[PDB]
Amino acid sequence: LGKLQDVVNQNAQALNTLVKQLSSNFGAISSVLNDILSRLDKVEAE
Amino acid sequence: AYTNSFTRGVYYPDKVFRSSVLHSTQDLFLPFFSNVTWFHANPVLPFNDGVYFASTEKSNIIRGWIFGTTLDSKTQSLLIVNNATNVVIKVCEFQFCNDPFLFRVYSSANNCTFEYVSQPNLREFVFKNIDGYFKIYSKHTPIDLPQGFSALEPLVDLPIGINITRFQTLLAAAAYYVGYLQPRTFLLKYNENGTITDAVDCALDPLSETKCTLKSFTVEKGIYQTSNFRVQPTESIVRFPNITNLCPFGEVFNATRFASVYAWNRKRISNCVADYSVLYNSASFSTFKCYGVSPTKLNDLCFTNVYADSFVIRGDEVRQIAPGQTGKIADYNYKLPDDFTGCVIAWNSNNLDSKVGGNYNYLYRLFRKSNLKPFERDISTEIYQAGSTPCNGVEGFNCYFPLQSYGFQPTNGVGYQPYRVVVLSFELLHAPATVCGPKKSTNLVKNKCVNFNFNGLTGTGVLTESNKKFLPFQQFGRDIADTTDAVRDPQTLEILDITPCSFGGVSVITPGTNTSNQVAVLYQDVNCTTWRVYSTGSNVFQTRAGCLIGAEHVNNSYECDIPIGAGICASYQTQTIASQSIIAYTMSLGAENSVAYSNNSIAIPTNFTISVTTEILPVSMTKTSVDCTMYICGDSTECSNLLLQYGSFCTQLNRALTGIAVEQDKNTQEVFAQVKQIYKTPPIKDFGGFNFSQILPDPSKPSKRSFIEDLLFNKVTLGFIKQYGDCLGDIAARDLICAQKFNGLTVLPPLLTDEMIAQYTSALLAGTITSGWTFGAGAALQIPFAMQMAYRFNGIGVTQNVLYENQKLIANQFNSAIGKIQDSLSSLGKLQDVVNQNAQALNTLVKQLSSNFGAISSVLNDILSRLDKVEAEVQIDRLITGRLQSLQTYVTQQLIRAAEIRASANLAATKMSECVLGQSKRVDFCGKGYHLMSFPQSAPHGVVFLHVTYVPAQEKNFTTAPAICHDGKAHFPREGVFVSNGTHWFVTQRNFYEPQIITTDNTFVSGNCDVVIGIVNNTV
Amino acid sequence: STECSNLLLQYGSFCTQLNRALTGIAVEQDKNTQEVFAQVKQIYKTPPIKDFGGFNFSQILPDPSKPSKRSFIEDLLFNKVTLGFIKQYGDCLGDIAARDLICAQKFNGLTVLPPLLTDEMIAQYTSALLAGTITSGWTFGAGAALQIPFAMQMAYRFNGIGVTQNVLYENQKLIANQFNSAIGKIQDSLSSLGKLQDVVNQNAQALNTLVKQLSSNFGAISSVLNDILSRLDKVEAEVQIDRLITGRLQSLQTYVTQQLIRAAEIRASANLAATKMSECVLGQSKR
Amino acid sequence: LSETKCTLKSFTVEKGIYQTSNFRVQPTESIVRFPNITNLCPFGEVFNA
Ligand SMILES: CCCCC/C=C\C/C=C\CCCCCCCC(=O)O
Ligand SMILES: *[C@@H]1O[C@H](CO)[C@@H](O)[C@H](O)[C@H]1NC(C)=O
Ligand SMILES: *[C@@H]1O[C@H](CO)[C@@H](O)[C@H](O)[C@H]1NC(C)=O
Ligand SMILES: *[C@@H]1O[C@H](CO)[C@@H](O)[C@H](O)[C@H]1NC(C)=O
Ligand SMILES: *[C@@H]1O[C@H](CO)[C@@H](O)[C@H](O)[C@H]1NC(C)=O
Ligand SMILES: *[C@@H]1O[C@H](CO)[C@@H](O)[C@H](O)[C@H]1NC(C)=O
Ligand SMILES: *[C@@H]1O[C@H](CO)[C@@H](O)[C@H](O)[C@H]1NC(C)=O
Ligand SMILES: *[C@@H]1O[C@H](CO)[C@@H](O)[C@H](O)[C@H]1NC(C)=O
Ligand SMILES: *[C@@H]1O[C@H](CO)[C@@H](O)[C@H](O)[C@H]1NC(C)=O
Ligand SMILES: *[C@@H]1O[C@H](CO)[C@@H](O)[C@H](O)[C@H]1NC(C)=O
Ligand SMILES: *[C@@H]1O[C@H](CO)[C@@H](O)[C@H](O)[C@H]1NC(C)=O
Ligand SMILES: *[C@@H]1O[C@H](CO)[C@@H](O)[C@H](O)[C@H]1NC(C)=O
Ligand SMILES: *[C@@H]1O[C@H](CO)[C@@H](O)[C@H](O)[C@H]1NC(C)=O
């Protein structure tokens, strides 16, 4: 039943990588909006 | 005297070596096929953007040139003259003559700076004047202007720094030419040595744009899409409100006494003209910064809500007048919004505000409970509580007077001297304005594409009367796309409509550059029944897909050659009375033939033919892998470290690529490894007189392939071991294969080799020739080939004695049919297209590494050789983002292709199972006709099916009846039909004429002979 | 904008790719139509004398008294779907462009190409198929068309499903009446195709969202190139124009990817239709 | 094997074949090649006239 199990595994893997990809910086100074907004004013945070 | 330059005037745009490449550049080039002016045996001509000067000479008559604006002693001029002994270059204030010649050129040389002297058959020169540099390119070539192509080389770049608008030649028989240069795009070609030997002028013709797009000098037969029809603007328009007065610069920047910072002032500015040049001789400003606009754009704008605030502060507090500052002034006195749009101006005023012994008339606030809001004022005078101890007016040790005083003395340090500050705020391009700049209006032009500037808003388009009613407080009008569509004229107050002046698609039909150089153009949004075209012609054909211009209409109908659209195709005549041309016609649907129907007539075949047809199906595509770090960062440790902030984006790509790679092997497996028993070819070749030698394995080759397989494997042009030293050095500069894998792009081999695939195919053939379809359902059982063919004939509705009586005819027909296929295979596009696509996808990925993506360069080493860590972290990230997007696009397209290839592979597997391991009843699934058998052959990345079918031929006409009434009962054939030749009645079969006597054995009676329609009589 | 045109050259290899994909799709569509309809290259004329055992085909055969040669049911079908046109520059110049919604698309570079086969040609193919199958049976799909009376063909077809032919020759009249009534019921029902309408709806929506997405800022100070260039000099305006270029290129890429994904499904449906034609119309099916 | 473990972000690996990074080689030394010039630029003339 590997043919059926593969679909479930693929869906779970996709949804888990989506969550894991929230810790990237993408070139910013931090990956946490709260940290960014606790230290910089509006113009520098935009 | 006009003349045509053809391809003269091409120079090297850079100083960098290139070879075996095609390069697209943009610079000031002399347009291809442009008319130059001819001078024989000395006027003053304009110098517009550069000049291409050429001289056919034999005795050194042309000596030099002079450049300038006016050639008298009121301006500076450049002299480049070649006297008999020297070449002298001077940039002075010359006084020249009407007719200078050699040496009497000028009279006085008053003052000047630049000087270079000493420097102890067809000539071409190019001149330019950019950023204060005079550049020259030149070349000499030994043998009115000739054909050919030559590229000029850089000579000198003089820093003269003057203004040039006219030039003149110096003469001492000969002739010279003069052509101007314009900013165009050109596609150059470097040969093996790095010399330029060809070029293409994009946007000179309709076929020249296609060449630039494809990045090739050749084009194949077809129809291509070009850019939409473009229209350039004719003239310019400026429309400001008509105002006369000048803004109150004196009252603001020149007042006698200024306000205090805590009680700052504010006055409105309206109905004036902003011209700040009047301040250039009275006031100097130490600080001047603007925020939502550029300082160089203030002259061309209009402003909506202008205010001016003024106060006095000490010297070192000027840095606190900015949007995001903190401190004593920004907290309790004056604050700017974070979205500020305006300018801030400050200057020293120690002469007007400083009195000896201390000036105490300027105050500020030092204590306050909380911070101020933007543009808020607080002029209170309440005592301030700072210790929780109450105090109702009394003062001391806990309660203070909020306001403090400045002490301004004339001998203070510059940090403690008074400064006057003015802040201007306004809005741009949203509402009606009454303060404009120093610009002069022009007339209003309608119904033409022109440039405009309406209250500072610039653009292009066509103006038109409008039927909208703006409210008094509105000035502009937008749409869903958020662009300005209507505007109210600021003088007449009428409303206009702005429309883009570019519209309509264009296409070009070409027969092939290897054949001809003429084309036809289709204007898809024009009705010629003429105007929105690049060129009219003698013949102009109007279709329902557009207006075709350049083809000759004909009234015959042929099959489609180049589909144009809406039922019309085009083709090259060539072979005709006229030299050659293009023709346009309507495609034909296949020569309507006939129908001969009646209620008592039938046709029955009397013969047959054996036909063999070929079918091709793709089964696999190439497998690849990617090293993301090596593609994005190369060998840079800095980039490698910066890339970790995108860590989860490379495993994601590699997983999909690995999935595709492992799917390919399953695709091949399901198609070819159906029978896991390997049957060897029989040792004696005797199958009822049928010849299979051209499809059975041949052991007289390095492999065991058959003749047809060997023919197939040579019609598609292509694992391997490419060693590092194999393409070390220059060889990597042209390989095109290890150029890929120097960047991290590899190709993985297939799991099953072509030898194994051929072994599987041979097993299939041996099984199906020796056993029939039994080996596909279980244990293989032997059966003679003639009897197997009898079975297969019984499977299509024909008796077996028909085969046993025409065995030799059938065998001969089959042998000839098999020979014809290998005859035709002499000189597979469906299989070749897969290889072409897989190669192009990988080559574009390498090509896309030369983009900037908005940075200053596409070379990490160049970026890192000039900038430090912080300044390079901003430029590297743009390249990282762009190069990640490229790989993502490649992977998505690969997935979308793999899905289609899998669909094809599944179809091929079903076809094998149903046509090769059995006989099929589905119509048109295993060929055209009645399917008898089929044989598989292997091709590169695909399979080939040879289908044998039965086709009837040579029909004859017969009369027929539905039933026969013998003696009051109704008789039915029970198999086949009743036919009559005119006097006698017989019963035969549907697919072959074979009459018999009507009797009870081949008949059944289930009627009374009263109701059947069409019953005859005769007898049985 | 010439400035934007010059700044866009640093993404030159991203437009040819999109155009290549779109051209592939557009070429595939004509092949889809051909494989389904142009199966037979011999056009058969409608019989001059209409005598088929009492069967009435008048509602599905070509009608020669219409501006085209479409049949009654075909016209009913064509009236139920609400969509090769020439739209001229002078046609929608002015305020009309603010509501047309068709030349608002093509003021921004988005155009639609006509199909290669017209509706009249497709109907001619269908008429040829009908005439062939009614006058020859299934022999014309295998070779030369051999004529046969319709009643005898129908007896063949009854034998094809295990019923003797006398069962047809003794109930011909009732069978013809039933067939005529059943045919009438279909045109009765076709009075007042959601599978076919969705294709048009999806394509139009995809084209309209592309035009709508041109008001996004993408992080810049404004979504208007003229507004950006009327206030900032080159150095300050390059920074803003780059963000707009990035966002709009991304929009185009998303549109193209969705178009490819839809083309795959349309191709699967077309392959099913071609196989169904071959097996159900040119023969008799046992599946 | 360690590179595979790091890529899979797991301390165990299942039976199979896995792709690792391309073959890498590090540089052995450093090189500098500027033109041979002796004179010193004229700072006095420009900044001290
Ligand atoms: C010696 C004490 C060190 C201070 C503790 C560290 C950080 C405190 C927060 C900010 C630094 C104080 C800066 C004061 C100078 C600016 C004063 C002003 O013009 O507003
Ligand atoms: C130009 O020459 C005149 C001589 O008449 C001289 O007075 C003037 O100073 C010169 N200008 C410069 C910039 O040297
Ligand atoms: C250009 O290079 C080829 C080999 O690459 C060489 O044979 C030829 O001589 C070169 N051309 C010149 C002008 O030297
Ligand atoms: C400012 O005032 C001084 C003295 O009153 C005067 O000389 C100067 O011209 C004035 N400047 C302007 C721009 O009015
Ligand atoms: C406005 O007044 C209220 C009530 O006195 C006060 O609480 C608030 O702080 C004031 N706003 C500012 C910006 O000081
Ligand atoms: C072009 O205009 C003419 C004039 O009205 C019209 O008859 C013709 O149909 C138009 N062309 C098309 C393709 O409709
Ligand atoms: C049937 O066709 C074959 C090949 O064309 C021919 O040799 C043979 O004579 C034909 N049979 C008759 C009865 O004509
Ligand atoms: C089969 O064909 C091959 C090639 O045409 C030929 O050499 C061979 O002799 C043929 N078979 C027989 C039995 O002749
Ligand atoms: C059968 O008769 C019809 C009607 O005359 C004719 O068109 C057809 O050609 C005939 N068949 C053959 C094989 O000649
Ligand atoms: C065919 O129709 C004609 C016309 O009425 C008729 O005379 C003839 O008997 C019919 N033949 C059959 C077999 O029904
Ligand atoms: C068949 O024969 C009967 C007499 O047995 C005759 O009455 C009848 O008319 C014949 N059929 C036709 C159509 O004439
Ligand atoms: C066939 O249908 C048409 C239209 O409904 C009708 O006019 C005709 O009468 C029908 N056939 C017969 C034989 O009545
Ligand atoms: C510049 O000239 C002064 C005056 O002689 C001298 O003291 C100084 O050293 C000179 N500059 C340098 C860099 O030596």
Numbering used by the authors:
A (entry chain C): 945 to 990
B (entry chain A): 27 to 67, 81 to 141, 157 to 174, 188 to 210, 215 to 243, 262 to 618, 632 to 678, 687 to 828, ...
C (entry chain B): 746 to 828, 832 to 940, 945 to 1039
D (entry chain C): 296 to 344
Task: Give sentences copied directly from the paper behind this entry.
The S trimer glycoprotein is responsible for binding to the ACE2 receptor and for viral cell entry after cleavage at the S1/S2 junction and S2´ sites. Receptor binding destabilizes S, allowing S2´ cleavage, leading to shedding of S1 while S2 reorganizes to mediate fusion of viral and cellular membranes, enabling entry of SARS-CoV-2 into the host cells. The furin cleavage site is a four amino acid motif located on a solvent-exposed flexible loop of S7. The BriSΔ variant, originally identified as a viral subpopulation from SARS-CoV-2 isolate hCoV-19/England/02/2020, comprises in the spike an eight amino-acid deletion encompassing a furin recognition motif and S1/S2 cleavage site.
We determined the BriSΔ structure without applying symmetry (C1) at 3.0 Å resolution. In our analysis, all BriSΔ particles exhibited the locked conformation of the S trimer we had described previously. In the BriSΔ C1 structure, we identified virtually identical tube-shaped densities in all three RBD domains, indicating high occupancy of all three pockets. Using masked 3D classification, we scrutinized the data set for potential heterogeneity in LA binding and found that at least 95% of the RBDs were LA-bound in our structure. Our HILIC-MS-MS analysis provides unambiguous, complementary evidence that the small molecule is indeed LA. Importantly, BriSΔ lacks 8 amino acids including the furin cleavage site and the S1/S2 cleavage site located on a flexible loop. This loop is now shorter due to the deletion and thus more rigid, as evidenced by density in the C1 map which allowed to build a poly-alanine chain. The deletion site itself shows smaller conformational rearrangements in BriSΔ when compared to WT S, confirming a more rigid arrangement of the shortened loop which in WT S comprises the furin cleavage and S1/S2 cleavage sites. A decreased stability of open BriSΔ trimer likely derives from the more rigid loop (T676-Q690) lacking 8 amino acids including two protease cleavage sites. The cryo-EM structure of BriSΔ evidenced exclusively particles in the locked conformation in which RBM binding to ACE2 is obstructed.
